[PDB]
Each structure stands twice: as C-alpha cells, then as structure tokens.
Amino acid sequence: GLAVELKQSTAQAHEKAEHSTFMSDLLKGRLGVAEFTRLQEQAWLFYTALEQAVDAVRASGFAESLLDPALNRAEVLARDLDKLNGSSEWRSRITASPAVIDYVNRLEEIRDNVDGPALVAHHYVRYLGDLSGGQVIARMMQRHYGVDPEALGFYHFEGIAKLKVYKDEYREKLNNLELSDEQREHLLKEATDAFVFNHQVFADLGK
Ligand code: HEM
C-alpha cells in the first residue's frame, strides 16, 4: 500500500534528518529560542508556498479529502512568529535561505502545473511529520527553552480532537488514492526530493 511504501522509501532519509547537526543541537537543548525561531521563519516561507500548491491541487479535484484545509499551518505559524519575535517586524526582515529558495521554487512549479501526485508527496512529508513527530518537537521546545505553548500553535492542530484516528484516516486516504504506475513512481521520487529540501533547510540554518 502507498502509505507503507512512502514510509519505507523515506525511512533512511528520515534517520539522516534526525542526525542533522542543526536539528540535533536544537532538540538536545544546545541552541535556544532564537534558533527555533529562525527555523519557524524558514518554515513559514515554505508552508506559505506549499499551501498555495495544496490550494491549486484541491481545486483541481485531486486527493480532495486528503487535503484538509484544517492542516494549513501558515497563518498559525505567523501568529507563533508574532509571539516569538515580539512584533510583526520579522515579516520584512526575513529572507529565504538558499535551501528555501529551491524548495519554494519546486512548490511553485507543482502549483502552476497542478501536479496532484507531486503535491501529495510534499503534503505527506510535511503534514504527516508534523502530526506524528510534532509533539516531540513541541515538548522539547517547552522543556529545553521554556517556549510558551501559545507560541507552538503550529504543533497543536487546532480543530483536530482524536489525533491518532486522524493519522490512521490520513494513511487510509493515501492507500485509497487512484494512481497510475507513472503517477505513483513520480510521487515516490518527489517524496525523496521533499526530504532532501528539508534536510538542506537544516544544513543552511546550521551555517
Ligand atoms: C527533514 C526533517 C523531517 C521530516 C520531513 C519528517 C517527516 C516525517 C514523516 C512524514 C513522518 C511520518 C512517517 C509515516 O508514518 O509514514 C515522521 C514520523 C516521525 N518523525 Fe519525523 N520528520 C523529520 C525530522 C524528524 C526529527 C528531527 C525527529 C526527532 C524528533 C522526528 C521524529 C519523528 C518521529 C518520532 C516519527 C514517528 C516515526 C519514527 O520514529 O521514525 N522527525 N516524520
């Protein structure tokens, strides 16, 4: 089934992402709220772009039940970043890292091509990770850095009650998607590139 083949085909990359120097230092408590904030600011850039692609693919009629607007992160993230930074200053100050310029360009290509299979790959890499390892990250930021839970909206998924059921249902939606051989191959390849872009976001933050 597709959910299983996704998890399998990216499990090695996921292990490598765990061991990125930036993210490893962050989660062991060696950095601080400033570096978590730098990450969130890059993520607001790529989630803005991802959610434009989502919106395009949802409107085309592809994977509609999977692309639940409730998952949208960008506006919650911006509220988090208002709290973390103390003001709206960050909006004119932030710039995309080179890793983010590549990731955003790919998401804009998927948007304008309305490429349903490529979009579902990027949707799985980001949102199932947020829904799945996100508490771990939200707990670490609270424990090591004292980040207020109100600045971790991104991880809360307001509007979802039973989270484990939602995850189960998300993976059943992936399994039930109609895909040709060419579309499934393209989706799997894109999921590998999604992890590659994410890992390079951390590499660039660590510079
Ligand atoms: C490039 C960065 C990362 C991405 C894109 C990503 C993405 C994902 C995705 C898509 C899943 C769900 C897999 C599935 O059920 O099919 C997941 C699971 C999970 N992630 Fe991540 N993730 C990343 C980094 C991390 C890091 C640094 C941690 C360390 C806290 C972590 C902790 C977890 C955990 C604990 C799971 C449940 C499965 C497992 O242990 O491998 N993730 N992630």
Coordinates of N, CA and C and ligand atoms in Angstrom, one line a residue:
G1 N 0.8 -1.2 0.0 CA 0.0 0.0 0.0 C 0.9 1.3 0.0
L2 N 0.3 2.4 -0.6 CA 1.1 3.6 -0.7 C 1.7 4.2 0.6
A3 N 0.9 4.2 1.6 CA 1.4 4.7 2.9 C 2.6 4.0 3.4
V4 N 2.5 2.6 3.3 CA 3.7 1.9 3.7 C 4.8 2.1 2.8
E5 N 4.6 2.2 1.4 CA 5.8 2.3 0.5 C 6.4 3.7 0.7
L6 N 5.6 4.8 1.0 CA 6.1 6.1 1.4 C 7.1 6.1 2.6
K7 N 6.6 5.4 3.7 CA 7.3 5.4 4.9 C 8.6 4.6 4.6
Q8 N 8.5 3.4 4.0 CA 9.7 2.7 3.7 C 10.7 3.4 2.9
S9 N 10.2 4.1 1.8 CA 11.1 4.6 0.8 C 11.9 5.9 1.3
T10 N 11.4 6.4 2.4 CA 12.0 7.6 3.0 C 12.6 7.4 4.4
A11 N 12.5 6.1 4.9 CA 12.9 5.9 6.3 C 14.5 6.3 6.5
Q12 N 15.3 6.0 5.4 CA 16.7 6.3 5.6 C 17.0 7.8 5.6
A13 N 16.3 8.5 4.7 CA 16.4 9.9 4.8 C 15.9 10.5 6.1
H14 N 14.8 9.9 6.7 CA 14.3 10.4 7.9 C 15.4 10.2 9.1
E15 N 16.0 9.1 9.1 CA 17.1 8.9 10.0 C 18.2 9.9 9.8
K16 N 18.6 10.2 8.6 CA 19.6 11.2 8.3 C 19.2 12.6 8.8
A17 N 17.9 12.9 8.7 CA 17.4 14.2 9.1 C 17.5 14.3 10.6
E18 N 17.2 13.2 11.3 CA 17.4 13.2 12.8 C 18.8 13.5 13.2
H19 N 19.8 13.3 12.4 CA 21.1 13.4 12.8 C 21.8 14.7 12.2
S20 N 20.9 15.5 11.5 CA 21.4 16.8 11.1 C 22.0 17.6 12.3
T21 N 23.2 18.3 12.1 CA 23.8 19.0 13.2 C 22.9 20.0 13.8
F22 N 22.3 20.9 13.0 CA 21.4 21.9 13.5 C 20.2 21.3 14.3
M23 N 19.5 20.4 13.7 CA 18.2 19.9 14.3 C 18.6 19.0 15.6
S24 N 19.7 18.3 15.5 CA 20.2 17.5 16.6 C 20.5 18.5 17.8
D25 N 21.4 19.5 17.6 CA 21.7 20.5 18.6 C 20.4 21.2 19.1
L26 N 19.5 21.5 18.3 CA 18.3 22.2 18.7 C 17.5 21.3 19.7
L27 N 17.3 20.0 19.3 CA 16.4 19.1 20.1 C 17.1 18.7 21.4
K28 N 18.5 18.7 21.4 CA 19.2 18.3 22.7 C 19.4 19.5 23.6
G29 N 18.9 20.7 23.3 CA 18.9 21.8 24.2 C 20.2 22.7 24.0
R30 N 21.0 22.4 23.0 CA 22.3 23.2 22.8 C 22.1 24.6 22.2
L31 N 21.0 24.9 21.6 CA 20.7 26.2 20.9 C 19.8 27.0 21.8
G32 N 18.7 27.5 21.3 CA 17.8 28.3 22.0 C 16.6 28.8 21.2
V33 N 15.8 29.6 21.9 CA 14.6 30.0 21.2 C 14.8 30.8 20.0
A34 N 16.0 31.5 20.0 CA 16.3 32.3 18.7 C 16.4 31.3 17.5
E35 N 17.1 30.2 17.7 CA 17.4 29.3 16.6 C 16.1 28.6 16.2
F36 N 15.2 28.3 17.2 CA 13.9 27.7 16.9 C 13.1 28.7 16.1
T37 N 13.2 30.0 16.4 CA 12.5 31.0 15.7 C 13.0 31.2 14.2
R38 N 14.3 31.0 14.1 CA 14.9 31.1 12.7 C 14.3 29.9 11.9
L39 N 14.2 28.7 12.5 CA 13.6 27.6 11.8 C 12.2 27.9 11.4
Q40 N 11.3 28.4 12.3 CA 10.0 28.7 12.1 C 9.7 29.7 11.0
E41 N 10.7 30.7 11.0 CA 10.6 31.7 10.0 C 10.8 31.1 8.6
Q42 N 11.8 30.2 8.4 CA 12.0 29.5 7.1 C 10.8 28.6 6.8
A43 N 10.3 27.9 7.8 CA 9.1 27.1 7.6 C 7.9 27.9 7.2
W44 N 7.7 29.2 7.7 CA 6.6 29.9 7.3 C 6.7 30.2 5.8
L45 N 8.0 30.4 5.4 CA 8.2 30.6 3.9 C 7.8 29.4 3.1
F46 N 8.2 28.2 3.4 CA 7.9 27.1 2.6 C 6.4 26.6 2.8
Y47 N 5.9 26.7 4.0 CA 4.5 26.4 4.2 C 3.6 27.3 3.4
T48 N 3.9 28.6 3.3 CA 3.1 29.6 2.5 C 3.1 29.0 1.1
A49 N 4.2 28.6 0.6 CA 4.2 28.1 -0.8 C 3.6 26.8 -1.0
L50 N 3.8 25.8 0.0 CA 3.2 24.5 0.0 C 1.7 24.7 0.0
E51 N 1.1 25.7 0.7 CA -0.4 25.8 0.9 C -1.0 26.5 -0.4
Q52 N -0.2 27.2 -1.1 CA -0.7 27.6 -2.5 C -0.8 26.5 -3.4
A53 N 0.2 25.5 -3.4 CA 0.1 24.3 -4.2 C -1.0 23.4 -3.8
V54 N -1.1 23.2 -2.4 CA -2.3 22.5 -2.0 C -3.6 23.1 -2.5
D55 N -3.8 24.4 -2.4 CA -5.0 25.0 -2.8 C -5.3 24.7 -4.3
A56 N -4.2 24.8 -5.1 CA -4.4 24.5 -6.5 C -4.8 23.1 -6.8
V57 N -4.1 22.2 -6.2 CA -4.4 20.8 -6.4 C -5.8 20.4 -5.9
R58 N -6.2 20.9 -4.7 CA -7.5 20.6 -4.1 C -8.5 21.2 -5.1
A59 N -8.3 22.4 -5.6 CA -9.3 22.9 -6.5 C -9.5 22.1 -7.8
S60 N -8.4 21.4 -8.2 CA -8.4 20.6 -9.5 C -9.2 19.3 -9.3
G61 N -9.5 18.9 -8.1 CA -10.3 17.7 -7.9 C -9.5 16.5 -7.5
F62 N -8.2 16.7 -7.3 CA -7.3 15.5 -7.0 C -7.1 15.4 -5.5
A63 N -7.3 14.2 -4.9 CA -7.0 14.0 -3.4 C -7.7 14.9 -2.5
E64 N -9.0 15.3 -2.8 CA -9.6 16.3 -2.1 C -9.7 16.0 -0.5
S65 N -10.1 14.8 -0.2 CA -10.3 14.5 1.2 C -9.0 14.5 2.0
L66 N -7.9 14.1 1.3 CA -6.6 14.2 2.0 C -6.2 15.7 2.3
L67 N -6.5 16.6 1.4 CA -6.0 18.0 1.5 C -6.9 18.8 2.4
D68 N -7.1 18.4 3.7 CA -8.0 19.1 4.6 C -7.4 20.4 4.9
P69 N -8.2 21.5 4.6 CA -7.7 22.8 5.0 C -7.4 23.0 6.5
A70 N -8.0 22.2 7.3 CA -7.6 22.3 8.7 C -6.2 22.1 9.0
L71 N -5.4 21.4 8.1 CA -4.0 21.2 8.2 C -3.1 22.5 8.0
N72 N -3.7 23.5 7.3 CA -3.0 24.7 7.0 C -2.3 25.3 8.1
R73 N -1.0 25.5 8.0 CA -0.1 26.0 9.0 C 0.3 27.4 9.0
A74 N 0.3 28.0 7.7 CA 1.0 29.2 7.6 C 0.5 30.4 8.5
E75 N -0.9 30.5 8.6 CA -1.4 31.6 9.4 C -1.2 31.3 10.9
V76 N -1.3 30.1 11.4 CA -0.9 29.8 12.8 C 0.6 30.0 13.0
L77 N 1.5 29.6 12.1 CA 2.8 29.9 12.2 C 3.1 31.3 12.4
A78 N 2.4 32.2 11.5 CA 2.6 33.6 11.6 C 2.2 34.2 13.0
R79 N 1.2 33.7 13.6 CA 0.9 34.0 14.9 C 1.9 33.5 15.9
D80 N 2.5 32.4 15.7 CA 3.6 32.0 16.6 C 4.7 32.9 16.5
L81 N 5.1 33.3 15.2 CA 6.2 34.1 15.0 C 6.0 35.6 15.5
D82 N 4.8 36.0 15.5 CA 4.5 37.3 16.2 C 4.8 37.3 17.7
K83 N 4.5 36.1 18.4 CA 4.8 35.9 19.8 C 6.3 35.8 20.0
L84 N 7.0 34.9 19.2 CA 8.4 34.6 19.4 C 9.3 35.9 19.2
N85 N 8.9 36.7 18.2 CA 9.7 37.8 17.8 C 9.3 39.1 18.5
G86 N 8.1 39.1 19.1 CA 7.6 40.2 20.0 C 6.9 41.2 19.2
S87 N 6.8 41.1 17.9 CA 6.2 42.0 16.9 C 6.1 41.4 15.5
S88 N 5.6 42.2 14.6 CA 5.4 41.8 13.1 C 6.7 42.1 12.3
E89 N 7.7 42.6 13.0 CA 9.0 43.0 12.4 C 9.5 42.0 11.5
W90 N 9.4 40.7 11.9 CA 10.1 39.7 11.2 C 9.7 39.6 9.7
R91 N 8.4 40.0 9.4 CA 7.9 39.8 8.0 C 8.8 40.5 6.9
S92 N 9.3 41.7 7.2 CA 10.1 42.5 6.2 C 11.5 42.1 6.5
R93 N 11.8 41.6 7.6 CA 13.2 41.2 7.9 C 13.7 39.9 7.3
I94 N 12.7 38.9 7.3 CA 13.2 37.6 6.9 C 13.5 37.4 5.4
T95 N 14.4 36.5 5.1 CA 14.8 36.2 3.8 C 14.9 34.7 3.6
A96 N 14.5 34.2 2.5 CA 14.7 32.8 2.3 C 16.1 32.3 2.2
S97 N 16.5 31.3 2.9 CA 17.8 30.7 2.7 C 17.8 30.1 1.3
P98 N 19.0 29.8 0.9 CA 19.1 29.1 -0.5 C 18.3 27.8 -0.5
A99 N 18.3 27.1 0.6 CA 17.6 25.8 0.6 C 16.1 26.1 0.4
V100 N 15.6 27.1 1.0 CA 14.1 27.6 0.9 C 13.8 28.1 -0.5
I101 N 14.8 28.7 -1.1 CA 14.5 29.3 -2.5 C 14.3 28.1 -3.4
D102 N 15.1 27.0 -3.3 CA 14.9 25.8 -4.1 C 13.6 25.1 -3.8
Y103 N 13.3 25.0 -2.5 CA 12.1 24.3 -2.1 C 10.8 25.0 -2.6
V104 N 10.8 26.3 -2.2 CA 9.7 27.1 -2.7 C 9.6 27.1 -4.3
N105 N 10.7 27.1 -5.0 CA 10.6 27.1 -6.5 C 9.9 25.8 -6.9
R106 N 10.3 24.7 -6.3 CA 9.6 23.5 -6.7 C 8.1 23.4 -6.4
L107 N 7.8 23.9 -5.2 CA 6.4 24.0 -4.8 C 5.6 24.9 -5.8
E108 N 6.2 26.0 -6.2 CA 5.5 26.9 -7.2 C 5.4 26.2 -8.6
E109 N 6.4 25.4 -8.9 CA 6.2 24.6 -10.1 C 5.1 23.6 -10.0
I110 N 5.0 22.9 -8.9 CA 3.9 22.0 -8.7 C 2.5 22.7 -8.7
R111 N 2.5 23.9 -8.0 CA 1.3 24.7 -8.0 C 0.8 25.1 -9.5
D112 N 1.7 25.6 -10.2 CA 1.4 26.1 -11.6 C 1.2 24.9 -12.5
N113 N 1.8 23.8 -12.3 CA 1.5 22.6 -13.2 C 0.3 21.9 -12.7
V114 N -0.2 22.2 -11.5 CA -1.2 21.5 -10.8 C -1.0 20.0 -10.8
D115 N 0.2 19.7 -10.3 CA 0.7 18.3 -10.3 C 0.3 17.5 -9.1
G116 N -0.8 16.8 -9.1 CA -1.5 16.2 -8.0 C -0.5 15.2 -7.3
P117 N 0.1 14.3 -8.0 CA 0.9 13.3 -7.4 C 2.1 14.0 -6.7
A118 N 2.8 14.9 -7.3 CA 3.9 15.6 -6.7 C 3.5 16.3 -5.4
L119 N 2.3 16.9 -5.4 CA 1.8 17.7 -4.3 C 1.5 16.7 -3.1
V120 N 0.9 15.6 -3.4 CA 0.6 14.7 -2.3 C 1.9 14.2 -1.6
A121 N 3.0 14.0 -2.4 CA 4.3 13.6 -1.8 C 4.7 14.7 -0.8
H122 N 4.7 16.0 -1.2 CA 5.1 17.1 -0.3 C 4.2 17.2 0.8
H123 N 2.9 16.9 0.7 CA 1.9 17.0 1.8 C 2.2 15.9 2.8
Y124 N 2.5 14.7 2.4 CA 2.8 13.7 3.3 C 4.1 14.1 4.0
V125 N 5.1 14.5 3.3 CA 6.4 14.7 4.0 C 6.3 15.7 5.1
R126 N 5.6 16.8 4.8 CA 5.4 17.9 5.9 C 4.3 17.5 6.8
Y127 N 3.0 17.4 6.4 CA 2.0 17.3 7.4 C 2.0 16.0 8.2
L128 N 2.3 14.9 7.6 CA 2.2 13.7 8.5 C 3.3 13.8 9.4
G129 N 4.5 14.4 9.1 CA 5.6 14.5 10.1 C 5.1 15.4 11.1
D130 N 4.5 16.6 10.9 CA 4.0 17.5 11.9 C 3.1 16.8 12.8
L131 N 2.1 16.0 12.3 CA 1.1 15.3 13.1 C 1.7 14.3 13.9
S132 N 2.8 13.6 13.5 CA 3.5 12.4 14.0 C 4.6 12.6 15.0
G133 N 5.7 13.3 14.6 CA 6.8 13.7 15.5 C 6.6 15.1 16.1
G134 N 5.4 15.8 15.9 CA 5.4 17.2 16.3 C 5.3 17.4 17.7
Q135 N 4.6 16.5 18.5 CA 4.6 16.7 19.9 C 5.9 16.6 20.5
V136 N 6.8 15.7 19.9 CA 8.1 15.5 20.4 C 8.8 16.9 20.3
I137 N 8.7 17.5 19.1 CA 9.4 18.8 18.9 C 8.8 19.8 19.9
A138 N 7.4 19.9 20.0 CA 6.8 20.9 20.8 C 7.2 20.7 22.3
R139 N 7.2 19.4 22.7 CA 7.7 19.1 24.1 C 9.1 19.6 24.4
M140 N 10.0 19.4 23.4 CA 11.4 19.7 23.6 C 11.6 21.2 23.7
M141 N 10.8 21.9 22.8 CA 11.0 23.4 22.9 C 10.5 23.9 24.2
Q142 N 9.4 23.3 24.7 CA 8.9 23.8 26.1 C 9.9 23.4 27.1
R143 N 10.5 22.2 27.1 CA 11.4 21.7 28.1 C 12.8 22.4 28.1
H144 N 13.4 22.5 27.0 CA 14.8 22.9 27.0 C 14.8 24.5 27.0
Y145 N 13.8 25.1 26.4 CA 13.9 26.5 26.1 C 12.8 27.4 26.8
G146 N 11.8 26.8 27.4 CA 10.7 27.5 28.0 C 9.8 28.2 27.0
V147 N 9.7 27.7 25.8 CA 8.8 28.3 24.9 C 7.4 28.1 25.4
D148 N 6.7 29.2 25.2 CA 5.3 29.2 25.7 C 4.5 28.3 24.8
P149 N 3.6 27.5 25.3 CA 2.7 26.7 24.4 C 1.8 27.5 23.4
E150 N 1.6 28.8 23.7 CA 0.8 29.7 22.8 C 1.6 30.1 21.6
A151 N 3.0 29.9 21.7 CA 3.9 30.2 20.5 C 4.2 28.8 19.8
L152 N 3.4 27.8 20.1 CA 3.6 26.4 19.5 C 2.3 26.0 18.8
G153 N 1.5 27.0 18.4 CA 0.3 26.7 17.7 C 0.5 25.7 16.5
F154 N 1.6 26.0 15.9 CA 2.0 25.1 14.7 C 1.8 23.6 14.9
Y155 N 2.2 23.2 16.2 CA 2.1 21.8 16.5 C 0.8 21.3 17.1
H156 N -0.1 22.3 17.4 CA -1.3 21.9 18.2 C -2.4 21.3 17.3
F157 N -2.4 21.7 16.0 CA -3.5 21.3 15.2 C -4.9 21.5 15.8
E158 N -5.2 22.8 16.1 CA -6.5 23.3 16.5 C -7.5 22.8 15.4
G159 N -8.6 22.2 15.9 CA -9.6 21.6 15.1 C -9.5 20.1 14.9
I160 N -8.4 19.5 15.4 CA -8.4 18.0 15.4 C -8.4 17.6 16.9
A161 N -9.4 16.7 17.3 CA -9.5 16.1 18.6 C -8.7 14.8 18.6
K162 N -9.2 13.8 18.1 CA -8.6 12.4 18.2 C -7.5 12.3 17.1
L163 N -6.3 12.6 17.6 CA -5.2 12.7 16.6 C -4.7 11.4 16.1
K164 N -4.7 10.4 16.9 CA -4.3 9.1 16.4 C -5.3 8.6 15.3
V165 N -6.6 8.7 15.5 CA -7.6 8.4 14.5 C -7.4 9.2 13.2
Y166 N -7.1 10.5 13.3 CA -6.9 11.4 12.1 C -5.7 10.8 11.3
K167 N -4.6 10.5 12.0 CA -3.4 9.9 11.3 C -3.8 8.6 10.6
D168 N -4.4 7.7 11.3 CA -4.9 6.5 10.7 C -5.7 6.7 9.4
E169 N -6.6 7.6 9.5 CA -7.5 8.0 8.4 C -6.7 8.6 7.2
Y170 N -5.7 9.4 7.6 CA -4.8 10.1 6.6 C -4.1 9.0 5.8
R171 N -3.6 8.0 6.5 CA -2.8 6.9 5.8 C -3.8 6.0 4.9
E172 N -5.0 5.8 5.4 CA -6.0 5.1 4.6 C -6.4 5.9 3.4
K173 N -6.4 7.3 3.5 CA -6.7 8.1 2.3 C -5.6 7.9 1.3
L174 N -4.3 7.8 1.8 CA -3.2 7.7 0.8 C -3.3 6.3 0.1
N175 N -3.6 5.3 0.8 CA -3.8 3.9 0.3 C -4.9 3.9 -0.7
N176 N -5.9 4.7 -0.6 CA -7.1 4.6 -1.5 C -7.0 5.6 -2.7
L177 N -5.9 6.3 -2.8 CA -5.8 7.2 -3.9 C -5.6 6.4 -5.2
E178 N -6.2 6.9 -6.3 CA -6.1 6.3 -7.6 C -4.8 6.8 -8.3
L179 N -3.9 5.9 -8.5 CA -2.6 6.3 -9.2 C -2.2 5.3 -10.2
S180 N -1.8 5.8 -11.4 CA -1.1 5.0 -12.4 C 0.3 4.7 -12.0
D181 N 1.0 3.9 -12.7 CA 2.3 3.4 -12.3 C 3.3 4.6 -12.4
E182 N 3.1 5.4 -13.4 CA 3.8 6.6 -13.7 C 3.6 7.7 -12.6
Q183 N 2.3 7.7 -12.1 CA 2.0 8.8 -11.1 C 2.5 8.4 -9.8
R184 N 2.4 7.1 -9.5 CA 3.0 6.5 -8.2 C 4.5 6.7 -8.1
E185 N 5.2 6.3 -9.2 CA 6.7 6.5 -9.3 C 7.1 8.0 -9.1
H186 N 6.3 8.9 -9.8 CA 6.6 10.3 -9.7 C 6.4 10.8 -8.2
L187 N 5.4 10.3 -7.6 CA 5.0 10.6 -6.2 C 6.1 10.2 -5.3
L188 N 6.5 8.9 -5.4 CA 7.6 8.4 -4.6 C 8.9 9.2 -4.8
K189 N 9.3 9.5 -6.0 CA 10.5 10.2 -6.3 C 10.4 11.6 -5.6
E190 N 9.2 12.2 -5.7 CA 9.1 13.6 -5.2 C 9.2 13.6 -3.6
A191 N 8.7 12.5 -3.0 CA 8.8 12.4 -1.6 C 10.3 12.4 -1.1
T192 N 11.2 11.6 -1.8 CA 12.6 11.7 -1.6 C 13.1 13.1 -1.8
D193 N 12.7 13.9 -2.9 CA 13.2 15.2 -3.0 C 12.7 16.1 -1.9
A194 N 11.5 15.9 -1.4 CA 10.9 16.7 -0.3 C 11.8 16.5 1.0
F195 N 12.3 15.3 1.2 CA 13.2 15.2 2.4 C 14.5 15.8 2.1
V196 N 15.0 15.7 0.9 CA 16.2 16.4 0.5 C 16.2 17.9 0.8
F197 N 15.1 18.6 0.3 CA 15.0 20.0 0.6 C 14.9 20.3 2.0
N198 N 14.1 19.5 2.8 CA 14.0 19.8 4.2 C 15.4 19.6 4.9
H199 N 16.1 18.6 4.5 CA 17.4 18.4 5.2 C 18.3 19.6 4.9
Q200 N 18.3 20.1 3.7 CA 19.1 21.3 3.3 C 18.7 22.6 4.0
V201 N 17.4 22.7 4.4 CA 16.9 23.8 5.3 C 17.7 23.8 6.6
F202 N 17.8 22.6 7.2 CA 18.6 22.5 8.4 C 20.0 22.8 8.2
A203 N 20.6 22.3 7.1 CA 22.1 22.5 6.8 C 22.3 24.0 6.7
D204 N 21.5 24.7 6.0 CA 21.6 26.1 5.9 C 21.4 26.9 7.2
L205 N 20.5 26.5 8.0 CA 20.3 27.1 9.3 C 21.5 26.9 10.2
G206 N 22.2 25.8 10.0 CA 23.4 25.4 10.8 C 24.6 26.2 10.4
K207 N 24.6 26.6 9.1 CA 25.6 27.7 8.7 C 25.0 29.0 9.3
Ligands
HEM1 C1 13.7 16.7 7.5 C2 13.1 16.7 8.7 C3 11.9 15.7 8.9 C4 10.8 15.3 8.2 C5 10.5 15.9 6.8 C6 9.9 14.4 8.8 C7 8.8 13.8 8.3 C8 8.2 12.8 8.9 C9 7.0 12.0 8.5 C10 6.5 12.2 7.1 C11 6.7 11.1 9.4 C12 5.5 10.1 9.3 C13 6.1 8.8 8.7 C14 4.9 7.8 8.4 O1 4.1 7.4 9.4 O2 4.7 7.4 7.2 C15 7.6 11.3 10.5 C16 7.4 10.5 11.7 C17 8.2 10.8 12.8 N1 9.2 11.7 13.0 FE1 9.9 12.9 11.6 N2 10.5 14.2 10.1 C18 11.7 14.9 10.2 C19 12.6 15.0 11.3 C20 12.4 14.4 12.5 C21 13.2 14.7 13.6 C22 14.5 15.6 13.7 C23 12.6 14.0 14.6 C24 13.2 13.9 16.1 C25 12.3 14.2 17.0 C26 11.5 13.2 14.2 C27 10.6 12.4 14.9 C28 9.7 11.6 14.3 C29 9.1 10.5 14.9 C30 9.4 10.1 16.3 C31 8.2 9.9 13.9 C32 7.3 8.6 14.2 C33 8.3 7.5 13.4 C34 9.8 7.4 13.6 O3 10.4 7.2 14.7 O4 10.7 7.3 12.7 N3 11.3 13.6 12.8 N4 8.4 12.3 10.3

